[PDB]
Symmetry: D2
């Protein structure tokens, strides 16, 4: 690999525009907030996207007896706490309107352990009035300027019978239109969008856009979900195990959908992938592994070519769709495990966070960039999906260099380093680990670091990087400005045992 000294294109920040979260009511938890702080220190997402804003634990919508009439009462006690805590961590709501508040619901169908109601409202004017009240309260508390930077998606996965009664397309379009007109009636520059579908039903997007064009309904972006797992071939009381398609299958989804939009009546609409991961199940052990990290590295590297954002589902294991987690590593979606133990996928994100803007080189296994200070940062990955026992990959890089000498820092996560899941197993898989076992897992969960000085002969540094199975590695290369001549008389040979 010959690395050009100059780039020309920029590597975009789309890969960290948004991250997913479990339902909004869980943001009230201290553990959730510990994990969000860690994520915002080490990664720094701009937006956060989750379900349940209008569900009943957050508690917004209630019907109250004042005399002999039921009247709506809007309780903002919890979401004011929640959004306050988001803004204090420099992250903003990617608002999702749903699910259906009980008192508004037209039927009983629910989804998840927490039972979000998945039926249309029994009265669409009550629904619009809910939407207007919530958007006006955001603007009252946080100001119009702030709330214009937010994003507003309507519903979640309406194409699926588990998420929306009868996967009724035309009723979803009615809910979309009522919600998007209500939002635009409070302020015309609020950004609203949909339809938030998952894969294998892309005509919904084309029908959605034809609907909004004909009926002149505002849409400011398209959203869609992307996963690559197949239906489980094995279930346990605890787990689903699923086969995964390769990362190219996911990147082909992004590209397919973008092509749908280009042929539509809104050819230039932003595309936001509002959930993605390998597996769509929150109890698939693959999410805890180094495989998951190496898999997601190619998405981070190329995803931004096709989409305006892609939101990893999720930043943390604080999640209740299938009940409270039953062991420390339980197959959860999170970048961060309970107790703030980063998983291998967490490090993939912090690695991409060290990259510069200027893109020098990219292929299917690496990306090489240049920073403002002139130094070079590269992330390399070795995704290996087969059962094999010794599938290393040598990469030789040839980096041009005017300096005399260079300092190289390399960080690695793989099946051996930065991998707390493997140590948790050597521990006997404790479900509810002691505080001491947890301190050990935190120590072990950190990337392996290696350093060297290298002299740069004939303008060039030669780097041969061996990548073990499912390794992701960051390599940073900086100019040594050597101060050693300043230490007049210095001689390590004068220290007992040295040089």
């Amino acid at each position: 690999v010959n690395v050009p000294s100059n780039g020309r294109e920029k590597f975009k920040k789309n890969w960290k525009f948004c991250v997913g979260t479990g339902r909004l009511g869980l943001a009230l938890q201290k553990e959730y907030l510990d994990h969000l702080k860690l994520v915002q220190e080490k990664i720094g997402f701009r937006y956060i996207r989750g379900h349940g804003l209008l569900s009943d634990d957050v508690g917004i919508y209630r019907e109250v007896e004042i005399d002999g009439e039921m009247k709506p009462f809007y309780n903002f006690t919890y979401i004011d706490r929640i959004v306050d805590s988001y803004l204090a961590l420099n992250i903003r709501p990617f608002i999702e309107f749903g699910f259906m508040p009980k008192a508004l619901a037209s039927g009983d169908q629910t989804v998840f352990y927490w039972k979000g109601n998945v039926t249309p409202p029994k009265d669409y004017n009550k629904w619009r009035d809910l939407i207007v009240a919530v958007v006006s309260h955001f603007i009252e508390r946080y100001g119009i300027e702030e709330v214009r930077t937010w994003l507003f998606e309507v519903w979640n996965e309406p194409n699926l019978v588990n998420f929306w009664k009868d996967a009724n397309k035309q009723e979803y379009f009615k809910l979309y239109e009522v919600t998007a007109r209500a939002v635009k009636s409070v302020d015309p520059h609020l950004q609203v969008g949909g339809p938030a579908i998952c894969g294998g039903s892309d005509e919904w997007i084309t029908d959605f856009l034809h609907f909004c064009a004909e009926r002149r309904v505002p849409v400011d972006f398209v959203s869609r979900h992307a996963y690559t797992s197949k239906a489980p071939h094995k279930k346990t009381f605890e787990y689903y195990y699923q086969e995964l398609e390769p990362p190219e299958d996911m990147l082909e989804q992004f590209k397919t959908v973008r092509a749908l939009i280009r042929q539509s009546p809104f050819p230039h609409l932003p595309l936001h992938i509002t959930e993605y991961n390998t597996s769509y199940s929150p109890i698939n052990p693959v999410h805890d592994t180094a495989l998951n990290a190496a898999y997601i590295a190619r998405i981070l590297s190329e995803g931004g070519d096709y989409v305006d954002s892609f939101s990893y589902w999720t930043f943390s294991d604080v999640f209740e769709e299938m009940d409270v987690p039953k062991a420390l590593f339980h197959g959860g979606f999170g970048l961060v495990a309970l107790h703030s133990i980063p998983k291998p996928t967490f490090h993939a994100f912090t690695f991409f966070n060290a990259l510069g803007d200027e893109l020098l080189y990219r292929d299917g296994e690496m990306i090489v960039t240049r920073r403002k200070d002139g130094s070079i940062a590269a992330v390399l990955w070795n995704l290996v999906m087969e059962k094999g026992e010794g599938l290393t990959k040598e990469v030789q890089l040839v980096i041009p260099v005017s300096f005399s000498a260079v300092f190289i820092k390399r960080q690695i996560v793989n099946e051996q380093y930065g991998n707390a899941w493997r140590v948790w197993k050597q521990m006997g898989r404790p479900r509810f680990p002691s505080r001491q076992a947890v301190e050990t897992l935190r120590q072990v969960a950190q990337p392996h670091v290696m350093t060297e000085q290298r002299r740069a002969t004939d303008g060039v540094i030669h780097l041969s990087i061996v990548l073990s199975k499912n390794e992701v590695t960051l390599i940073e290369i900086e100019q040594v400005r050597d101060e050693t001549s300043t230490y007049v008389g210095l001689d390590d040979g004068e220290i007992t045992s040295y040089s």
Copy 2:
């Protein structure tokens, strides 16, 4: 090495009774308080011992004109702050009375960059009144029960001309007596001692105790310093380099001094080694190295056999005896470097801090203990003082183990791992590193961790441990209570690329 299953002897906590510090005026620094918090978190010393309580930066003794007379004014502003901050970190003062305030000094001779005055008081009754005022202030602010746990040392190294005018033996005995009687006069339980002498003239200890015997002077303990370095053979504007004697020569020092006490009129006096380190210079690079940590490990394993406490000089590179530090790694005495970067010797101490009470085995290269919960903890070291390179040892441990499933955690510091000084050289030795260079040094300064599960064939576990040159390693061996049978149907072979 076949490790017994039962102990008989305890391993004493003497090795962390006390640690040394730069002069007390430096405890006002935020950086000093940062390193102290780090050390108290990971090691947990009981006492802290430094110079300069009565020197002029701390400000206690002034003369002021009142009613046409020079009268003493005792300013407690700074040592109230200093001692309040020690008690907040659970550490107590091992109080050293010195050096001589300027307004009390009889002559002009000083020591150190900060100019402690090293001459007797112009008036011994003024000195006694100072001592009484200081001790009584301590009782008023902290209460008698707290202050009775502190210890009181008189002066420092009065056998060296640098530290006491003319190294005047009889003048020192006189200062001692006035000081000791002053302290006892405030409260009979306050423990006072001396003569705080360095190596090379232990006739001072026998004479000091003869003087106390004959003049009926209180003495509650004997204090002595120990170093193993020869006078410097090479000096730079920045460094002293010195040859070192092997660690046995320091343990002979402890033993010899203990013999001299047992031969004296006070045969049961506690012995405190109130400073020790390899080199007595605060500008000798050996202190920054893994050599220093392997050398110190031998001392921590056996020093407690001969003495009641031995105080490592010092917990921190916050130090000014030879002027402000001129580079990050400058030969300082500290366990912790500036920016709270732990040196190799810091880890030697945190490793001994994981050892249990019950001593199962000790030789010149390892110590093996058992904890209350039944786990085994061992520290091993490979000290190599020659310039060689081919001095990697191999150790075979046979450890009895009632369990049958074992989790082994190992931590390593050596020339490669946990070693910031080496990476600092790879960086070009920055004198004044950037924030990012400092964050990198903090990561690389962490011990390397390795873990495994092992089955215990025959109720014993055979470990073979390779120790590289000047490695110190902690090995912890704990019972697995395996929970994997409760994961009914678990099969990592069903995860893509896995078992």
Copy 3:
């Protein structure tokens, strides 16, 4: 009032043995843990008592299909997190076993907005096994010594139909026996008790204790709830308004239940009042008022003469029994309001917290104590239950004192000071106030401080104290050790405008 100079009687610490809380699942909230940290810093309770350990949000009990059979699974994820957080704040669980896990319930009846199921177990042996699993877990994680210090209550208000199917007395006695015997089977030193009833059916206490004697069921203490409000006479969509009885009526309940126990077959059983407040409704505005503070002071004053502990319901407005709070001050039981604004009652507890052990004087309006350092601390209160108006009381304290000069610090909470509820109404009663309005309510919630120096004649000081309507006041009287003579030449008359 002449205050005796020496005491004889001790003022017990019983008043802060225990506090109440909202259901345990709420302890996962960051807001809860902020309020708890504030209460533990300023008051420092030993135990905390709440409902829902076994209810389904905490998630302990699940039935899971293990290939062929429905088997129990015990998920400790959440209560380990919760009990870890209590022990880090130095507070211990007063464990209440309840309510009924949905998967164990024999019928459908529930209580509260969070739906605790209130029916007996379908299988008493499954219940027993739940209990043994939970207690054994606590021991494994925290150790027997720690767990022996906790207390274990069985269910809650089983004499009320809303709390227990049919208020069925014999069914409750059976659940008790099964739970008590299960706890004793794990460890015999664990303390278990009941019946946790409210007022108005004290034959339950005599029947419970007769049941336990006849069947030799272990009982280690008796618990009882006490309130003085009548049933609501006015309801709003948001409030219950209730008339109160005077505080003597509550003290008469304490005394009465103690009398029942002394005539029982267990005449020496500890009595724990496991809940008390003025009103039993979490939506009665009286709880936010200065009236409530003056009413409770009387109880803190004397309650401990009759009972071993009395647990204020509750430490915080973080509470959901009647749904999420609909305004800042909404009649909540808490000492601390949302945003960690202390209500008037909080300050009544902080004031009793400045009292010494030595009891000098007490009557129905004041308590006077002497501290170990010799200083005097008194709390005085002017409870006025009538609609009256400028109802101002005068007290004259003749306080014996050897000193000669005294420093007096007085802190006042009343309808004017330390009263955020009154300022909140001045603000227009914002339901969901902005951050700036909150910082204001926090300022205004602080007690008013007044101070003076008084010269005290005849070993005696004369204190005349005006108390406004529903005022609570702390007065502290300290010896002045005057340092003014040391400021030779001081003259405030030499400062412009001063003396």
Copy 4:
């Protein structure tokens, strides 16, 4: 007083552009950083200005033996920590080059307890190289863009014999030229100024600018100091008492100086008052008083009309020009006393910090502003320099109000409230107070808060404000948007003892 409803003119933020500090070596103290954090939370200065950057405790300039010769060595260890800590608290240095490093000094004369050397350099080329090295290291560590916003002042009070050998004007101009030219040679955009003189010799400012015009020396700003105390009429071993000129005398200094600049060859140069206070002594008790707050308030109100910044000397009592402070309140210059106890003057600044941009009305006793949200903020003060008793002013504000219901919040500091000095005296003036005595003084140091709701009468609200002797008060008036009609059924009459 009739306040107009509209403004046109803006009240500028000049009053908080810069604040003074004790010598830069003190910034290493934890206590200094505590006080700076408090000041930055509640006031928020942009720059900070102190002495001793080039003095020997900060340690930059050293001469070192390298082989035969004495070479310069620049030690940046300490100022890097210091400047890092400033920028972490969002405050930037107003760099002052001085005093003279010992090893560059041409003579022995020193100033202050800490002995800053006050003589010209022995070689002006070494000085230049010092200045070039310091400025280049700043740009290396912090970047040119950050450093371009800093200001660089040369020396301090060179017109005073105590500050500059012989008060030699031409040696000063020569030092200025060398320093100004060295700063520009590193980067021409850097802002350099002088001559940093105290009052009573403004001919120095005209000779200074005549010198710069004729010799073509860069000057980017003029600097000068302002004080109004006369020579001490009474001295104590610990105090100077001084008569104070009225506040107009200081505003007339500012206005006089700005007129000198306008008539000079550089008519558009910024004027920075780099130190001001009432007394120039750091042991004058007037600084701890409410008089000092009321005095300074007139300056904050108008000073900005004449000068670009005016820097209160100083933010904190962490100071050592006249030795360590001998008591809690010792007449020090600071806004914040030791233990982070705000003095009354601290509150004058936080009160001005509540003011809005738009100026409505200002006279010699008050200033009234409007904020962006429409609310009104006023600071009023009652400066009384004579010794009388009841010296109360009454002010009647008639406020134009577009509202209809108004919430009014007043904060008060005077001889009774917000005044820890008065209470410290009632305590017997403890020199070195306990932790409890300090906690009491911190409570008492808080401003007194009063609130009310007021109905706006015909378009207007009438306010009558009674100001006691030396009061400073903030009054904020905000629209009540009343939520009470939302509380359908609410009746405080239903709460026992209420409406």
